[PDB]
Design an enzyme around this catalytic site. Structure first.
Site, mmCIF file in Angstrom:
data_model
loop_
_atom_site.group_PDB
_atom_site.id
_atom_site.type_symbol
_atom_site.label_atom_id
_atom_site.label_comp_id
_atom_site.label_asym_id
_atom_site.label_seq_id
_atom_site.Cartn_x
_atom_site.Cartn_y
_atom_site.Cartn_z
ATOM 1 N N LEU A 12 0.818 -1.213 0.000
ATOM 2 C CA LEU A 12 0.000 0.000 0.000
ATOM 3 C C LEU A 12 0.853 1.264 0.000
ATOM 4 C CD1 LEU A 12 -2.763 -0.967 2.655
ATOM 5 C CD2 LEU A 12 -2.994 -1.128 0.160
ATOM 6 N N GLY A 15 7.286 4.636 2.982
ATOM 7 C CA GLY A 15 7.853 5.919 3.418
ATOM 8 C C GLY A 15 8.745 5.846 4.645
ATOM 9 N N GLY A 16 8.890 6.983 5.331
ATOM 10 C CA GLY A 16 9.608 7.058 6.611
ATOM 11 C C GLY A 16 8.965 6.218 7.709
ATOM 12 N N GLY A 18 7.620 3.142 6.845
ATOM 13 C CA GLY A 18 8.061 1.803 6.466
ATOM 14 C C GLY A 18 7.356 1.187 5.270
ATOM 15 N N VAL A 20 3.786 -1.044 4.295
ATOM 16 C CA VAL A 20 2.436 -1.411 4.717
ATOM 17 C C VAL A 20 1.773 -2.205 3.600
ATOM 18 C CG1 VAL A 20 0.251 -0.549 5.722
ATOM 19 C CG2 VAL A 20 2.344 0.811 5.934
ATOM 20 N N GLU A 89 -6.488 -2.331 11.466
ATOM 21 C CA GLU A 89 -7.737 -2.349 10.715
ATOM 22 C C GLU A 89 -7.551 -1.633 9.380
ATOM 23 O OE1 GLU A 89 -11.125 0.126 11.833
ATOM 24 O OE2 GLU A 89 -9.852 1.444 13.023
ATOM 25 N N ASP A 135 2.321 14.037 14.017
ATOM 26 C CA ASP A 135 2.478 14.027 12.566
ATOM 27 C C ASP A 135 1.117 14.162 11.902
ATOM 28 O OD1 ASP A 135 3.941 14.088 10.221
ATOM 29 O OD2 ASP A 135 4.240 11.904 10.126
HETATM 30 O O1 XIZ Z 1 -0.800 3.252 10.954
HETATM 31 C C1 XIZ Z 1 -0.237 3.309 9.831
HETATM 32 O O2 XIZ Z 1 0.927 3.738 9.656
HETATM 33 C C2 XIZ Z 1 -0.934 2.871 8.694
HETATM 34 C C3 XIZ Z 1 -2.236 2.361 8.780
HETATM 35 C C4 XIZ Z 1 -2.956 1.979 7.642
HETATM 36 C C5 XIZ Z 1 -4.227 1.429 7.765
HETATM 37 C C6 XIZ Z 1 -4.933 1.078 6.602
HETATM 38 N N1 XIZ Z 1 -4.400 1.277 5.396
HETATM 39 C C7 XIZ Z 1 -3.190 1.815 5.244
HETATM 40 C C8 XIZ Z 1 -2.435 2.181 6.358
#
Ligand code: XIZ
Length: 274
Positions: A12, A15-16, A18, A20, A89, A135
């Site tokens: 997905l 970045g900084g 990591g 996902v 989630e 952030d």
């Molecule tokens: O907490 C995060 O850094 C990312 C959460 C997230 C949740 C659902 N979709 C993409 C990223």
């Protein structure tokens, strides 16, 4: 259990924060996000109600974990030899506010009101649970398109909330307050309000107000789009140079521009075409 418990999908984000991945809980086909954080890149840690040494991120997520849908929920986590894996989630369908704004340009004020209000409820939830996000920005905000509900994500730059001064920061520079730029000092709440002023401006103008340190320090706000007088007032208030001249969360939510917010679902019906 870990590999048998989750079915890993496509990447997905990168970045900084990591890496996902989209995922599916094999148990009940629940949509999840699988976030990987490298131990070597983790700069501060804490401990759980009993716990071993976990990333601060996990500490903060567990502290804001609840039924409230305004903050991403941490469902599980795992420790590997060189990383931690966070099961979060995942709403579906979903889009982040950065992509949303990129696609659609400046938001109508009514939509910006609904979105900002929800951001405010979410951040207040964090502060109440003793967590400072640090952030706050469009990229760290997911929109559950079907329900019209926003979710704060990425607590990887966060800290426990305190009333004493912070001397460390590792969020996003362009959303950081002039007292950080100028002195390397800030307080949590007033710095959060500043970044909320940046976000609101971003929502109504389609881009952030400052790019360089000098603009941040000068704190002069130019509106590139038609923005109502009251919204401009709220934005300029959040972006006051002196931290103590900034509105409290209560004052933000009592502001005339914030009156008569849409329910999230009314928001999705009108502006999200569901
Ligand atoms: O907490 C995060 O850094 C990312 C959460 C997230 C949740 C659902 N979709 C993409 C990223």
């Amino acid at each position: 259990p870990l590999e048998s418990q989750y079915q890993v999908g496509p990447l997905l984000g990168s970045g900084g924060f990591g890496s996902v991945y989209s995922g599916i809980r094999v148990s009940d086909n629940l949509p999840v996000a699988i976030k990987h954080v490298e131990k070597d890149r983790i700069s501060d840690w804490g401990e759980l109600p009993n716990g071993t040494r976990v990333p601060m991120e996990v500490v903060l997520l567990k502290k804001v974990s609840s039924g409230f849908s305004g903050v991403i929920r941490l469902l599980d986590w795992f420790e590997r030899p060189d990383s931690f894996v966070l099961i979060l989630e995942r709403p579906e369908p979903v889009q982040d506010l950065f992509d949303f704004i990129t696609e659609r340009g400046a938001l109508q004020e009514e939509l910006a009101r609904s979105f900002f209000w929800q951001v405010l409820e979410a951040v207040r939830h964090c502060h109440n649970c003793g967590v400072l996000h640090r952030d706050i920005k469009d990229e760290n905000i997911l929109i559950d398109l079907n329900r019209g509900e926003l979710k704060l994500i990425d607590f990887g730059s966060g800290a426990l909330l305190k009333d004493t001064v912070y001397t460390d920061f590792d969020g996003t520079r362009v959303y950081s307050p002039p007292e950080w730029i100028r002195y390397h000092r800030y307080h949590g709440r007033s710095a959060a309000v500043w970044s909320l002023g940046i976000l609101l401006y971003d929502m109504v103008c389609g881009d952030i107000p400052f790019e360089h340190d000098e603009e941040i320090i000068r704190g002069q706000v130019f509106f590139r789009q038609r923005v109502s007088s009251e919204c401009q007032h709220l934005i300029r208030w959040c972006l006051a140079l002196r931290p103590s001249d900034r509105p409290t969360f209560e004052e933000i939510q009592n502001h005339p521009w914030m009156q008569d917010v849409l329910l999230p679902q009314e928001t999705a019906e009108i502006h999200l075409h569901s």
